[PDB]
């Protein structure tokens, strides 16, 4: 019915809440994104070791060259991470 | 995985920009490496 | 957080549901895709109401032209649009 809408609105709540507390209320700055990911995923992320890796991934993820991660870009990347997790599921054997 | 999600592909690049860099690369490797020794011939011919 | 993880999980659940609904292995035929769409997003989305849109979306989703959709394609584009809707809502409407 509206379960994908539920998932999408949960996504919105989470990343907006993680943006606001740390920086500009809406978009995803570098520090916002770093703490956000820390909040988001544990036991799977390899970016935890270095925040400079977060910085450079932010630099790429900001092909627009503004230093702030757009919502569309972030959602497409986390969709690629869904891709990676499904690949993980298949790799399991 | 995010290290490669970028993927910065060459095949998507516009033709003119790719050609402009291809000329640079070709000049840098092939033409520059090519070795021609004409000094001896030129000096002998001029001296004669 | 783990809630966002569960959001990806919900995406995967809904995908595999309609990938096997018509038995299309793990990839959405035109019919599976249509039924999927009007199931998950009742309202803002239209497939039955807009069959020409369904056909154009068949071509656009299937840039490969296979006519079937795997996880990467729709996750990218559908996530982008469905999240950007509310971003526009906040911005202006
Ligand atoms: Ca922000
Ligand atoms: Ca950006
Ligand atoms: Ca299928
Ligand atoms: Ca396709």
């Amino acid at each position: 019915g509206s379960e994908l809408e539920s998932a999408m609105e949960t996504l919105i709540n989470v990343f907006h809440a993680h943006s606001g507390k740390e920086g500009d209320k809406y978009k995803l700055s570098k520090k916002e994104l770093k703490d956000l990911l820390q909040t988001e995923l544990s036991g799977f992320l390899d970016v935890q070791k270095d925040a400079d890796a977060v910085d450079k991934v932010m630099k790429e993820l900001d092909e627009n060259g503004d230093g702030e991660v757009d919502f569309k870009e972030y959602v497409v990347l986390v969709a690629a991470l869904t891709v990676a997790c499904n690949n993980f599921f298949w790799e399991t054997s | 995985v995010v290290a490669c999600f970028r993927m910065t592909p060459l095949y998507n690049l516009p033709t003119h920009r790719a050609c402009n860099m291809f000329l640079e690369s070709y000049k840098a490797s092939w033409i520059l490496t090519e070795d021609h020794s004409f000094e001896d011939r030129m000096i002998d011919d001029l001296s004669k």
Side-chain angles (χ1 to χ4, degrees), chain A, chain B:
Chain A
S2 293
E3 295 302 320
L4 277 296
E5 295 302 320
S6 178
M8 183 278 288
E9 183 65 13
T10 61
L11 294 174
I12 287 178
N13 289 337
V14 57
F15 61 81
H16 186 273
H18 292 171
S19 296
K21 64 97 180 172
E22 184 165 2
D24 56 287
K25 293 184 175 71
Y26 293 79
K27 306 300 291 186
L28 292 168
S29 179
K30 189 273 190 187
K31 64 183 181 293
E32 298 188 350
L33 187 153
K34 182 257 292 180
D35 177 86
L36 182 148
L37 294 174
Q38 288 159 5
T39 55
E40 295 309 334
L41 274 298
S42 179
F44 298 159
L45 78 172
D46 193 4
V47 304
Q48 188 274 331
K49 67 182 290 294
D50 291 331
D52 180 64
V54 176
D55 186 74
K56 64 92 173 180
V57 168
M58 182 278 288
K59 180 67 174 66
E60 285 85 65
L61 167 59
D62 289 331
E63 183 181 350
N64 300 310
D66 56 297
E68 198 77 18
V69 176
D70 184 61
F71 301 111
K72 290 180 175 178
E73 298 174 279
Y74 182 76
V75 299
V76 166
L77 270 67
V78 301
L81 277 296
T82 300
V83 166
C85 183
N86 290 282
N87 296 115
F88 182 76
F89 182 76
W90 284 295
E91 295 302 320
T92 301
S93 67
Chain B
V1 299
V2 61
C4 291
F5 291 167
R6 185 58 151 196
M7 186 64 72
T8 178
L10 169 66
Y11 49 80
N12 286 344
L13 193 69
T15 302
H16 54 273
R17 218 168 306 293
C19 286
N20 286 311
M21 296 169 306
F22 166 83
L23 295 177
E24 171 58 66
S25 66
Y26 184 60
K27 182 176 76 69
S29 55
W30 290 72
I31 294 167
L32 277 177
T33 50
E34 190 64 52
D35 179 75
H36 189 218
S37 67
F38 66 100
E39 292 93 355
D40 203 22
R41 293 190 296 107
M42 200 186 148
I43 295 309
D44 185 75
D45 302 353
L46 284 185
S47 68
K48 284 196 287 290

